[PDB]
Amino acid sequence: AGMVMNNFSLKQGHCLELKGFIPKDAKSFAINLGKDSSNYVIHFNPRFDHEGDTNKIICNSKEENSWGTEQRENVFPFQQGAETSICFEYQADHLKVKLSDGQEFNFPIRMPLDTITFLSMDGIELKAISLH
């Protein structure tokens, strides 16, 4: 399984930047942010070829281990065998996801939330995390 960070605090109006290396044979990778392993405010899942999706980003929420409604984005500035950096900005009722090429999209926050305290990731090798 991937790597987990817990009991940091990402507060409203701030962003968490992740930089990582995507393996050359990656079919997908996921970065999860939320409250614990059962509660993801965002599951951010770029898919190269996975679950029938080619070069799409699938986002979803997970509340008490139940997936919500998926959000599909055609933006896809990712390459296999390369570094990528993504910023997750926390606003009252949505996360703003900021990509390395300047493209951005919002994802609604569907669950009660004070601070973001949990991160996990899978399919991508950590290079750096930082809080702004």
Ligand X SMILES: OC[C@H]1O[C@@H](O[C@H]2[C@H](O)[C@@H](O)[C@@H](O)O[C@@H]2CO)[C@H](O)[C@@H](O)[C@H]1O
Which of 15, 22, 41, 45 forms a contact with ligand X (CB under 6 A)?
Answer: 45
Helix (H, G, I), strand (E, B) or coil at 79: coil
Binding to a second copy (CB under 8 A): which residues in 91-130? Answer: 126-130
**CA–CA distance from 67 to each of 52, 70, 132 (Å)?**
18, 8, 28
- Considering the rule CB under 6 A, would residue 58 count as an interface residue with ligand X? yes
Nearer to ligand X by Cβ, of 122 and 125: the residue is 122
Q: Rounded to 5 degrees, what are φ and ψ at 16?
A: -115, 120
- Residue 45 interacting partner from ligand X, a second copy, none (CB closer than 5 to 8 Å by kind): ligand X
CA pseudo-torsion sign 53, 125, 64, 106: negative
Binding site for a second copy (CB under 8 A): 1-8, 19, 126-131
